[PDB]
């Protein structure tokens, strides 16, 4: 999921964590940064009886 985000990273064109996974990228023509998130997130189901 690509969501426009409200930070203002000045350096680079796209950003990755220390593990090399894409975190955000910058629209160069406008300077706006968009964060990239997984489509689904992990959960824990509580299974009793």
């Amino acid at each position: 999921i690509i969501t426009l985000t409200n930070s203002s990273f000045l350096a680079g064109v796209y950003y990755t964590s220390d593990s090399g996974q894409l975190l955000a990228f910058k629209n160069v023509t406008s300077g706006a940064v968009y964060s990239v998130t997984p489509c689904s997130f992990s959960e824990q189901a509580a299974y009793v009886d």
């Binding site: 000045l10 680079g12 990755t16």
Partner: protein, 363 residues
């Protein structure tokens, strides 16, 4: 009084800043003075600026092919051959200061704004009918409120150049001193920019020479990748050829002029910086980058590698020299320090970044 004069340097109210360059020396502090209050027609040479009715500025050989200046109260910048022959308003408060400074083919004027002009000249000779300045001076502004009030200016020695947060005193071994802010010293990458972490990377952080150039002044200079760069070293100089040179500025308007950055290859080919979207005219056109709205750092290194804001936009053949043409600043917030140029050599350094900027380094 200099309250109005320094308010022309548009600065935020609660900010304390450092002024550098050919400013008014002052009438009472130091040696300085030389305020020619009377029409004595003083005659001095080697002058690089005047402050304040007749003014005549000319080359020392008094070349008829060189343009001389004559201000009388009308202004004529003329050879026998006239470029400007007109009349200019000359009304000011008695405490207002108007000055002109010439250096490196550049002229700066203080007529209600910090006007900047490019003009190839040699203007040490001058006659007049109120003081001279030959060497750069330095001030501090303890500004506390907008306008004239709260500026609280004072003069100071050269040590104040270390007060500005964007310049540093280079250690004798070439290391950047600890505690530097690295405000716009982006780590260099051809790829994704690390957000938060630590990397041991080969980066040009072994600085040999740092030029703290006042914001209001541009720079026309020739740098070579085989000789030590010229200019006044801010700290301990290192007599080493630059593997990279790093330009740290404030606003993008410095570079927008055509031919601002001219890169000379070992083949002798010239790459001229052009914007309209920035290309490198080859004398064909090579696309550099869609220039970001805020250019803060341009680092150019031999091995044919140019970076804007710490990104690998373009790679070229092995360079040997660079010529600049930087064009001052926007005259809307200047001299809150200096815009700098650092000659650097590559080094393996441990770099910690949070956000996207360096925060501490270890060679």
């Amino acid at each position: 009084n200099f309250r109005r004069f320094f308010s022309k340097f548009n600065v935020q109210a609660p900010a304390v800043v450092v002024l550098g360059g050919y400013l008014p020396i002052g009438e009472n502090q130091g040696v300085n003075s030389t305020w020619y209050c009377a029409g004595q027609h003083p005659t001095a040479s080697g002058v690089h600026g005047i402050f304040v009715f007749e003014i005549g500025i000319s080359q020392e050989p008094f070349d008829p092919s060189g343009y001389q200046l004559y201000l009388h109260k009308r202004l004529r910048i003329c050879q026998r051959n006239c470029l400007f022959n007109k009349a200019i308003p000359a009304h000011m408060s008695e405490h207002s200061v108007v000055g002109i400074t010439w250096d490196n083919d550049r002229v700066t004027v203080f007529s209600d704004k910090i006007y900047y002009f490019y003009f190839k000249n040699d203007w040490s000779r001058v006659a007049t009918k109120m003081q001279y300045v030959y060497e750069p001076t330095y001030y501090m502004l303890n500004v506390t409120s907008a306008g004239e009030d709260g500026i609280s200016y004072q003069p100071c020695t050269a040590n104040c150049i270390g007060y500005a947060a964007n310049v540093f005193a280079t250690e004798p071994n070439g290391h950047i001193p600890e505690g530097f802010s690295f405000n716009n010293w982006f780590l260099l990458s051809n790829d994704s920019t690390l957000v938060h972490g630590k990397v041991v990377s080969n980066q040009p952080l072994l600085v040999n020479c740092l030029l703290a150039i006042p914001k209001i002044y541009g720079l026309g200079q020739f740098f070579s990748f085989n000789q030590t760069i010229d200019g006044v070293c801010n700290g301990a100089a290192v007599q080493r050829a630059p593997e990279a040179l790093r330009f740290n500025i404030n606003d993008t308007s410095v570079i927008l002029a055509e031919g601002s950055i001219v890169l000379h290859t070992a083949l002798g080919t010239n790459f001229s910086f052009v914007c309209s979207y920035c290309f490198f005219k080859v004398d064909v056109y090579k696309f550099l980058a869609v220039l970001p709205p805020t250019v803060r750092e341009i680092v150019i290194t031999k091995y044919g590698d140019v970076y804007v804001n710490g990104f690998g936009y373009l790679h070229l053949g092995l360079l040997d020299a660079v010529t600049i043409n930087f064009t001052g600043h926007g005259t809307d917030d200047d001299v809150s320090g200096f815009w700098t140029i650092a000659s650097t050599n590559f080094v393996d350094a441990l770099i910690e970044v949070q956000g996207t900027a360096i925060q501490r380094i270890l060679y």
